[PDB]
Amino acid sequence: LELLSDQGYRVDGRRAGELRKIQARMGVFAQADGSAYIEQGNTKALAVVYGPHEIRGSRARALPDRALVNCQYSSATFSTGERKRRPHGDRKSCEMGLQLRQTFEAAILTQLHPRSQIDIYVQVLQADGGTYAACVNAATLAVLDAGIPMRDFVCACSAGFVDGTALADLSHVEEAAGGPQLALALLPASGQIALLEMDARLHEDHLERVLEAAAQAARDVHTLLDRVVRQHVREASILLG
Amino acid sequence: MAMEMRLPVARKPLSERLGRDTKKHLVVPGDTITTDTGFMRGHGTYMGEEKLIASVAGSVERVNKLICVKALKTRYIGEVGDIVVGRITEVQQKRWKVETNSRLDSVLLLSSMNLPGGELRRRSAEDELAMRGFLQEGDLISAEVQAVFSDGAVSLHTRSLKYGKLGQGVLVQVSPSLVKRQKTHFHDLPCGASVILGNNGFIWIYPTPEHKGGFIANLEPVSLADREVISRLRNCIISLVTQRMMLYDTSILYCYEASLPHQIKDILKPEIMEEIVMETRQRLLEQEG
Amino acid sequence: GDHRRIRGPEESQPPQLYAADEEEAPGTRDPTRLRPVYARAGLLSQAKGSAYLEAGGTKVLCAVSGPRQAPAALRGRLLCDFRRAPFAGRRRRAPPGGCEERELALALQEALEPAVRLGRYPRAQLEVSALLLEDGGSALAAALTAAALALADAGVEMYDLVVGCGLSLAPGPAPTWLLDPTRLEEERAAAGLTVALMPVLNQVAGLLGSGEGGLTESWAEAVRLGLEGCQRLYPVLQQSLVRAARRRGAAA
Amino acid sequence: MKETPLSNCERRFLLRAIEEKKRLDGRQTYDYRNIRISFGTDYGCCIVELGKTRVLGQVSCELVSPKLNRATEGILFFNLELSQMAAPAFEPGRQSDLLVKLNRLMERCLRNSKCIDTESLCVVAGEKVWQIRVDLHLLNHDGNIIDAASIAAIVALCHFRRPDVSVQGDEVTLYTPEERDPVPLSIHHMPICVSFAFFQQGTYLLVDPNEREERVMDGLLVIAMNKHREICTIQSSGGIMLLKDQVLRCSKIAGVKVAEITELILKALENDQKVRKEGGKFGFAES
Amino acid sequence: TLSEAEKVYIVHGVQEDLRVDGRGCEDYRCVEVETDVVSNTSGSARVKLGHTDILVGVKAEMGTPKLEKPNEGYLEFFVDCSASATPEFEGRGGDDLGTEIANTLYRIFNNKSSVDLKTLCISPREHCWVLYVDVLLLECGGNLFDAISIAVKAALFNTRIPRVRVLEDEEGSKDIELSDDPYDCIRLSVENVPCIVTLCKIGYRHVVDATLQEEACSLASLLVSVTSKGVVTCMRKVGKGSLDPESIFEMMETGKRVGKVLHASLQSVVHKEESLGPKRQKVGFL
Amino acid sequence: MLKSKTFLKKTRAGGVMKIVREHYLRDDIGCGAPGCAACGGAHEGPALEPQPQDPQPHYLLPDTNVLLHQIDVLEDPAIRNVIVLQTVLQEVRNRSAPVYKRIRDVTNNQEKHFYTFTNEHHRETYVEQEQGENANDRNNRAIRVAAKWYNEHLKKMSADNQLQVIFITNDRRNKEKAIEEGIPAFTCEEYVKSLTANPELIDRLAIIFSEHLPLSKLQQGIKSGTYLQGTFRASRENYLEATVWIHKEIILQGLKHLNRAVHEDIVAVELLPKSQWKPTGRVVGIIKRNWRPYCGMLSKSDIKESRRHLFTPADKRIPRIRIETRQASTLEGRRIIVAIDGWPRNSRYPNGHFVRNLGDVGE
Ligand SMILES: [Zn+2]
């Protein structure tokens, strides 16, 4: 086992500065107002966006100024090799919900759908590292498929630090190694970060490196996603007439 | 009987079977529309640092000086004369609350719904209590919009007796961006039925009567020769939509005329679906030009 | 650890599993037999309606907390809470449950909604509460019958009563359908079944079943047998309700 | 109940005083409030009050069967409770988002940074190990918690002492604090968070915000640090668009702030030990 | 939900032996079956029946057997009724349906003759296999139970438990010996694993694959559990309505026939797929 | 390209599960030789040389066993050039830490050209796994494909008057199989003889413990007969001569007869026939373990990823211990203390755990 061979390679067979081929799709589930699917390697996220619709059981929470974003997270039991129970209600899925919510409330541009629920839902079928970013990106594709206005692709990814170098788009192996992993989600057009999570010990001067590396990885993810989206829009329009 | 299982086949994307190479201007969020002296913005964009930035996925449209976007999937925004079909959800002391494919809960004021025949004097408490016994929760109404409020909601009414409550019929829910904005959504086809094409994504299909406003329920049977046609139209509409093409009189009539050889059930299997849709599309395209 | 109950031990296994013996088998009996039934309505005071049913080791209560504010949308509701006392059955289970209590609750609700007429109880929810003091055989059927008695007692409207009956399958070489069995005949069994009907209009209201095996004809014979059993049981419940009404007339 | 709403007057006044770089009580932007660290009688209790925000911290131990994946190292159990005395809105089971985010943040910060030695606290590898839980309680709510919660957990976990144990083979013998002298814990480095608050989409940033500043802020950047300049965690909340230089500067700030807080904590522990070595069951330190 | 006149339309249609999809009363619809979707599992499957999409994972873990039955292992079922189906599900609202479905799935397998668990025992009272099945809902378009059952069976058929030798040793030291032959993994028979069949009664005629719009029009529904032989493991009843004693028999006979057909088709399909091999490329969600 | 490789694993919690990893087959990997354009010209770092001369050109690549048993034949400077693979290096890493470390320390030398080639992540030489073929066969076939691939590549590059590759084995089975696969192949002995250089080259080359019966049988046998308990003790003299004192003095030698005792325990000695005796005893069980925290130091494995580390106590009368700590950075240099937890039937060392650190040596 190892993380960075002396040559520069990883285990999976990719250098530090690159990442794994995301393979996505938009339009899985038709009974909804927006759906997506993404596999950022072995990972497999799945998003859904029930559009800006009415509040029931009003319970005096229908914001009159803006819209109400309600995003729910879920990590299937058979996702990890170690089976787990209680995928919802846990103290971690709810944190992921908070994160997604404060991201998309920033991006989703709610000032135009006042007194309306935007219900986001995310299910992770398979997890092999990078479990938050895949979900961010799937939910982004969903939002877009639902014609919901949004400032910019909110593209997310993760970086890490090993042997005085920065890795991009960690996997489960180096995620279990305990090294510093920094996940983030930014808006490329403006260069602004919508979220910045991070969990491990490391020096300070080694921060700018992993930071710009994660940013560049997110730019690449932006390229791939936008190519997908453009193919989708082109095909749909062609089919219209 | 007959049951059949089959594995999933992989899609064939790029729609190369057409080969169009459209002459449009597609965009996605973050994209920068032409930045010039005083260009007005419309639905599907916004401004940042003196720069016009898209907000939604679709093609850009530049009317004389107005820049707008025309997304490919949305929820029904309220116009002012568009007809509409709606499923009721609630009955408030003053009005009815209706569900369209809209971003809020459409509203039919008790003042709007027409009365049995033309017995028009005014609305009193007796009408406020018949507010329920006539228009049950869950029923359907074929109306046209009256106005759009600043909060986004849509108040709709019933101009005449051709509108109001609907019979038994059948219904479909499609996307609202797949019905051509045109006139006479209310069609009565030669096949032996009639159809209503909402400016929203609610299509209604009812057998055409012989006498020629919903105040009575004719809960009689329907001749097989008029239910088979309705079912075929239903499946043909679902076919059309699954292939992402527009929807109006000629489209449905020609998919119908195409699906006579293929029986009333075997025309959702994606191969038959696709070939019927291709035939219809080609013949429309060639006849119209 | 639950912070709403007393601090007990983490785990606790019973002694039987540590026993060493071949438990006694029942043997033979008249397959079309029924146990002696004691059904009385009007037991409990603080409840609008209550009923109690005993059949062998089976001992069940049911109470009905009446209409409590909470067309096809202004249609009544009834929510049923089945609950076996922790001191019933060879083994102990914490009060909550969460596996079979809810299944049997769904069963009771699906078997009661038909009989009860809820158009005359709009905007209201009837809280039915069953309690199983001792398990000795057919339990869900006793619970249906007891809930029916409690409802008819509280004076909720209906179309007809609900009578249940439980059946089992003898795993012998010539398997015969055993009617109204015991917990022993039920733990030493291959298949189990439960019918519940409304005998006047002769309509099932809710049934259920399961099997180490079986076949169409066998299940059908089981069904009809349980129907006959329920018919033969109805008069007991009839007399019980009449008796309770007479006692009420006496009180005033 | 509910928190009294915020008037537009106060909101605008605050935004303006920020524009002009004026806090309310009279301090700058790169300043905390006087934080006091007071100790109790029982090893493991600490009341830390920054300005008006008081938080209590207790540390307790147990012996339990470990988890199979880690049969060598022990366990650690965080918990933060928001007592209804902290503020009205803190009814039980209602403000769950805040509980979740705070607890996850604190767990992450302390546990995953490897602040203490989960190995040193092994007794029987496979059968019985220690279990250190830490209960923080919020008493008064005026502004900054994470900083207070962290300072409390740290002062406790550095001011706690275990019942000594002897072992031979499998024979394990626990003893009482009166028969022997309890043994302290094993810390490697003491991290304590630092909270920055963003106003006007990112233009202005403050330290140790009060409750009002938390009501008229859009974003919160938490940064955990040590005296050795080692990022342990950083988090952005509030749905806000920051940049790089901002986090760099905030980190160069957290450095100094944590250094100073750490000096104080050490002084507090020193004074408490000195007192108990002279007769007295308390210990007090002031910023 | 829906109105009353639509219900009249649908019920007279059934009574006339037609349906909005122009199909009779004994006709399912094309069910797209797939297997080996997810990789981290010891078995998996996916179904798309009209507009209901189910995923199923199966994990073979090692655990202590059950005291009353140490000679063999056990199946456990969990059911995530993800809100992605209908937003009216959440962290608390889907527990109801999940519990119902799980209790059913258990009731289908307290049979002792469906999955030969004796084949899942390593060392009695000491170690055993445990099959954690995990159903995951993604749409609700009716005929839910039948699809869930088909997925359970396709996943079992596609399950590959590894061989393990658990060798005892003195002084309480245990060792597990694997077989480094992922191609030599054992396979459990499914010649008895049953399919569910949901006969919903509409008017005076019974129907299979009861689409939602038709479920709302009904009053009772008999669930049967059939094996490829013809027996009937389970026979449950669900609905807020009544049900005659005679119609039960017709329902059961029809369930028998439909189960025969269903199991035949599934067996043929999955043998086909197992034959093809990795050449299939495993198109899923793409 | 992309390849999904699966494999099973035994957990720490006495369980089994599965992993499914990815494997990217890059085609931009370098041979190490400058001449081979279409592989990359500007390629610095450790790399080969254009004209080698000790079949004069003679690049070569060895197999695992050679790295494991003749590294000194290679560490020598009389040679100049050689190719190294990935599988060889991975196996070396798995078996021996020192050998792997030496090979890395040499690959770090720009002069002694131990250019490495990542075959696993290459589109051509890579080879999948096959049912009925152990991992050793996997690696062997991979090395053969690499050799064959190397011969073709360097063949088409130029006129072949400049470079030719060689395969090197230790046992002749592999060599003969290679020949039957259609390539050159030698053994290290033939080669190291063929160069007729200075003789320095040839000069630089020329337990499972018994069971333990439970306390029941021991206590039953002592009273009844043969077995007898006593205090075990060792000596600074030798790791094998030990003395048991009965409650008389028995002696016993050999790591088996020393069936997992320690300076002060309670062993259940059995007596050996008089054909070996001053007497000679044997151990079959323990009545009472009597341990204590032993002070010492943490000798690490140079692998900075490894968790298992060896511990040396101070009293020579104790065996080193095999502990699990992850730190291995703060402790080396500081006397620690460790507590023993067992001695199963597989390890010449026991399993312990850290309990506290004291301070650097010398203080
Ligand atoms: Zn080359």
UniProtKB/Swiss-Prot annotation, chain A:
Localization: Cytoplasm; Nucleus, Nucleolus; Nucleus; Nucleus, Nucleoplasm
Record's keyword annotation contains Acetylation: yes
Entry superkingdom: Eukaryota
One GO CC term on file: euchromatin
A UniProt-annotated Pfam family: RNase_PH
Biological processes, Gene Ontology terms: defense response to virus; DNA deamination; histone mRNA catabolic process; maturation of 5.8S rRNA; nuclear mRNA surveillance; nuclear-transcribed mRNA catabolic process; poly(A)-dependent snoRNA 3'-end processing; positive regulation of cell growth
Cystine pairs: none
Keyword rRNA processing part of the UniProt annotation: yes
InterPro entries: ExoRNase_PH_dom1, ExoRNase_PH_dom2, ExoRNase_PH_dom2_sf, PNPase/RNase_PH_dom_sf, Ribosomal_Su5_D2-typ_SF, RNase_PH
GO MF terms, alphabetically ordered: 3'-5'-RNA exonuclease activity; mRNA 3'-UTR AU-rich region binding; RNA binding
SUPFAM superfamilies in the cross-refs: Ribonuclease PH domain 2-like (SSF55666), Ribosomal protein S5 domain 2-like (SSF54211)
Keywords recorded for this protein, A-Z: Acetylation, Cytoplasm, Exosome, Nucleus, RNA-binding, rRNA processing
Family: Belongs to the RNase PH family.
PANTHER family the record matches: EXOSOME COMPLEX COMPONENT, EXOSOME COMPLEX COMPONENT RRP41
Oligomer status and interactors: Component of the RNA exosome core complex (Exo-9), composed of EXOSC1, EXOSC2, EXOSC3, EXOSC4, EXOSC5, EXOSC6, EXOSC7, EXOSC8 and EXOSC9; within the complex interacts with EXOSC2, EXOSC7 and EXOSC9. The catalytically inactive RNA exosome core complex (Exo-9) associates with the catalytic subunit EXOSC10/RRP6. Exo-9 may associate with DIS3 to form the nucleolar exosome complex, or DIS3L to form the cytoplasmic exosome complex.
Official protein name in the record: Exosome complex component RRP41
Swiss-Prot record, chain B:
GO cellular component, one term: nucleolar exosome (RNase complex)
Entry-annotated residues carrying Phosphoserine: 124
Keyword RNA-binding annotated: yes
An annotated Gene Ontology molecular function: 3'-5'-RNA exonuclease activity
Swiss-Prot/TrEMBL GO biological process terms: CUT catabolic process; exonucleolytic trimming to generate mature 3'-end of 5.8S rRNA from tricistronic rRNA transcript (SSU-rRNA, 5.8S rRNA, LSU-rRNA); nuclear polyadenylation-dependent rRNA catabolic process; nuclear-transcribed mRNA catabolic process; poly(A)-dependent snoRNA 3'-end processing; positive regulation of cell growth; RNA catabolic process; RNA processing
All copies of domain S1 motif, residue ranges: 79-159
Cross-referenced CDD domains: KH-I_Rrp4_eukar, S1_Rrp4
Record keywords, A-Z: Cytoplasm, Deafness, Disease variant, Dwarfism, Exosome, Nucleus, Phosphoprotein, Retinitis pigmentosa, RNA-binding, rRNA processing
Domain of life per record: Eukaryota
Regions annotated as coiled coil: none
Pfam family, one: KH_6
Keyword Ligase: no
Localization in the cell: Cytoplasm; Nucleus, Nucleolus; Nucleus
InterPro entries linked to this entry: Exosome_cplx_N_dom (IPR025721), Exosome_RNA_bind1/RRP40/RRP4 (IPR026699), KH_dom_type_1 (IPR004088), KH_dom_type_1_sf (IPR036612), NA-bd_OB-fold (IPR012340), RRP4_S1 (IPR048565)
Family membership noted in the UniProt record: Belongs to the RRP4 family.
UniProt disease link: Short stature, hearing loss, retinitis pigmentosa, and distinctive facies: An autosomal recessive disorder characterized by childhood myopia, early onset retinitis pigmentosa, progressive sensorineural hearing loss, hypothyroidism, short stature, brachydactyly, recognisable facial gestalt, premature ageing and mild intellectual disability.
The name this protein goes by in its record: Exosome complex component RRP4
UniProtKB/Swiss-Prot annotation, chain E:
Keyword Iron part of the UniProt annotation: no
Alphabetized CDD domains for the sequence: RNase_PH_RRP42
One GO MF term attached to the UniProt entry: RNA binding
Primary localization class, coarse: nucleus
Subcellular location: Nucleus, Nucleolus; Cytoplasm; Nucleus
Sequence positions bearing N6-acetyllysine: 112
Chain positions found as Phosphoserine: 173
A GO-annotated cellular component: nucleus
UniProt keyword terms in alphabetical order: Acetylation, Cytoplasm, Exosome, Nucleus, Phosphoprotein, RNA-binding, rRNA processing
InterPro entries the record matches: ExoRNase_PH_dom1, ExoRNase_PH_dom2, ExoRNase_PH_dom2_sf, Exosome_comp_Rrp42_subfam, PNPase/RNase_PH_dom_sf, Ribosomal_Su5_D2-typ_SF
Pfam families: RNase_PH (PF01138), RNase_PH_C (PF03725)
One of the GO biological process terms: rRNA catabolic process
Subunit comment: Component of the RNA exosome core complex (Exo-9), composed of EXOSC1, EXOSC2, EXOSC3, EXOSC4, EXOSC5, EXOSC6, EXOSC7, EXOSC8 and EXOSC9; within the complex interacts with EXOSC2 and EXOSC4. The catalytically inactive RNA exosome core complex (Exo-9) associates with the catalytic subunit EXOSC10/RRP6. Exo-9 may associate with DIS3 to form the nucleolar exosome complex, or DIS3L to form the cytoplasmic exosome complex. Exo-9 is formed by a hexameric base ring consisting of the heterodimers EXOSC4-EXOSC9, EXOSC5-EXOSC8 and EXOSC6-EXOSC7, and a cap ring consisting of EXOSC1, EXOSC2 and EXOSC3.
Family per similarity comment: Belongs to the RNase PH family.
Name of the protein in its database record: Exosome complex component RRP42
Species the sequence originates in: Homo sapiens (Human)
UniProtKB/Swiss-Prot annotation, chain F:
Superkingdom, natural source: Eukaryota
Chain ranges of the PINc domain: 58-176
Post-translational modification N-acetylmethionine, affected residues: 1
GO biological process: CUT catabolic process; nuclear mRNA surveillance of mRNA 3'-end processing; nuclear-transcribed mRNA catabolic process, deadenylation-dependent decay; RNA catabolic process; RNA processing; rRNA catabolic process; rRNA processing
Location(s) in or outside the cell: Cytoplasm; Nucleus, Nucleolus; Nucleus, Nucleoplasm; Nucleus
GO cellular component term, pick one: nuclear exosome (RNase complex)
Location, primary (coarse class): cytoplasm
Tissue specificity comment: Widely expressed.
Residues modified to N6-acetyllysine: 18
Single annotated GO MF: guanyl-nucleotide exchange factor activity
Domain called CSD1: residue spans: 208-277
This protein's UniProt keywords: Acetylation, Cytoplasm, Endonuclease, Exonuclease, Exosome, Hydrolase, Magnesium, Manganese, Nuclease, Nucleus, Phosphoprotein, RNA-binding, rRNA processing
Limits of the CSD2 domain: 310-363
Subunit structure: Component of the RNA exosome complex; within the complex interacts with EXOSC4, EXOSC7 and EXOSC9 of the exosome core complex (Exo-9). The catalytically inactive RNA exosome core complex (Exo-9) associates with the catalytic subunit EXOSC10/RRP6. Exo-9 may associate with DIS3 to form the nucleolar exosome complex, or DIS3L to form the cytoplasmic exosome complex. Exo-9 is formed by a hexameric base ring consisting of the heterodimers EXOSC4-EXOSC9, EXOSC5-EXOSC8 and EXOSC6-EXOSC7, and a cap ring consisting of EXOSC1, EXOSC2 and EXOSC3; DIS3 associates with the base ring of Exo-9.
Family: Belongs to the RNR ribonuclease family.
Record-given protein name: Exosome complex exonuclease RRP44
Species of the source: Homo sapiens
